[PDB]
């Protein structure tokens, strides 16, 4: 199996600027390579066929080059609607393999996340459930590390994380982290901490609370 590698899951760019996504085939697939673009909830769109040919209807801003083992997709001047996923794919020898994709994102001013932590509601506790929710909103860059601490020790079991793609309006990211325990275990601990590590502060952002303590 040939392996298409797109070393950059994400690439920061700006509207009106030039950007180049790279692809590296594990083997010489000659010129049998295609580039696709994909927007959320839609199917891929062919942009480049046979290494460096624009498919019909594909605007002059899109270009591709390479032939052999290294290929590169380029956008002369990025437009708002170009901030999507671009996939690499070799069709030299079966099985056809796709690269892992590269998502172009808008670069903006650094923004610290606003962190909020929430204890389990009384209604959930009555059902025998205990979820501690932590919101980390409107931050940039997307690079962030969320850790949960229970009575001091880090907890990794029972954590479910969810996040939104870059906002189309303020170019930030947001995330939700939920620690879900049973009421039994929740009541056997006292200290619950949500800890956010982001480049915007030397010290990680920390939010906590003590069971039964205001």
């Amino acid at each position: 199996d040939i392996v298409m590698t797109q070393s950059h899951k994400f690439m920061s760019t700006s509207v009106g600027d030039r950007v180049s996504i790279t692809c590296k085939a594990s083997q010489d697939v000659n010129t049998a390579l295609a580039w696709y673009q994909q927007i959320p909830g839609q199917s891929p769109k062919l942009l480049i066929y046979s290494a460096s040919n624009r498919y019909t209807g594909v605007p002059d801003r899109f270009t591709a080059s390479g032939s052999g083992t290294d290929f590169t997709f380029t956008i002369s001047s990025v437009q708002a609607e170009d901030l999507a996923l671009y996939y690499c794919q070799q069709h030299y020898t079966t099985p056809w393999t796709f690269g892992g994709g590269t998502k172009l994102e808008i670069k903006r001013a650094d923004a610290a996340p606003t962190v909020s932590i929430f204890p389990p509601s009384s209604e959930q506790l009555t059902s025998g459930g205990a979820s501690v929710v932590c919101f980390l909103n409107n931050f940039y860059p997307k690079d962030i590390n969320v850790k949960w601490a229970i009575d001091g020790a880090e907890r990794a079991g029972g954590v479910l994380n969810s996040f939104t793609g870059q906002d189309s309006k303020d170019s930030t990211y947001s995330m939700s982290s939920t620690l879900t325990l049973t009421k039994d275990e929740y009541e056997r601990h006292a200290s619950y901490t949500c800890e956010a590590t982001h480049k915007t502060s030397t010290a990680p952002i920390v939010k906590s609370f003590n069971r039964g303590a205001a």
Binding site: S43, P44, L46, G100, T114, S121, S131, A214
Partner: protein, 220 residues
């Protein structure tokens, strides 16, 4: 006007298989081979195999050995995707065809068919109000409230704040599996406006015909 119409999404149980459909149109169906591609959130796009309606039958990807034995049928110009075992096969499946004669690149794609494998049955969500500890209203000029929705199936649920009148400063996150889809939403307003001016999350779950409007109140 080449077009590939895929089938609506389906929710098979962790055990059986499902035959997907793709209705080609706008071109002589038998002149091009049909391809199928899989797309999971963590593994990206993976080619499954092709089929010649003129009949050259198939050729599958090593990885999709017998779990994917394609099939087609002329006189209707539709291609089918069997899906055998099914359990980790939860994802979106695409129907793909090439453009020019000499380039295996896929110029034409179907809209995709979502497939979710789960043993769970339709289940209404529990909705839990998230308010800052000890009521109050934070310690700054802004306060964040929340709504936790969990234990439901299948997707989706719609969530709004104050019947939609509260839309700014809202963050509603993608639901994550776990037996009963669970998702949450946060809303951030001016500290002095809550609990002065009530805030309620409205959660609706079509599948169960259920709705829950949970008001967020100070708590101890």
């Amino acid at each position: 006007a080449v077009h590939l119409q895929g089938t609506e999404l389906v929710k098979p149980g962790a055990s059986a298989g499902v035959k997907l459909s793709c209705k080609a149109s706008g071109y002589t169906f038998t002149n091009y081979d049909m391809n199928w591609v899989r797309q999971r959130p963590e593994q990206g796009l993976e080619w499954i195999g092709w089929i010649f309606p003129g009949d050259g039958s198939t050729r599958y990807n090593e990885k999709f050995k017998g779990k994917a034995t394609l099939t087609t049928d002329k006189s209707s110009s539709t291609a089918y995707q069997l899906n055998r075992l099914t359990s980790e096969d939860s994802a979106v499946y695409f129907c793909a065809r090439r453009g020019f004669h000499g380039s295996y690149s896929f110029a034409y794609w179907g809209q995709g068919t979502l497939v979710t494998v789960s043993g769970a049955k339709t289940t209404a969500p529990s909705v839990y109000p998230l308010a800052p500890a000890a009521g109050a209203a934070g310690a700054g000029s802004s306060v964040t409230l929340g709504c936790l929705v969990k234990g439901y199936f299948p997707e989706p649920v719609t969530l709004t704040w104050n019947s939609g009148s509260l839309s700014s400063g809202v963050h509603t996150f993608p639901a994550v599996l776990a037996d009963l889809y669970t998702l949450s939403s946060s809303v951030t307003v001016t500290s002095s406006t809550w609990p002065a001016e009530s805030i309620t999350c409205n959660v609706a779950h079509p599948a169960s015909s259920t709705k829950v409007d949970k008001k967020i109140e100070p708590r101890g």
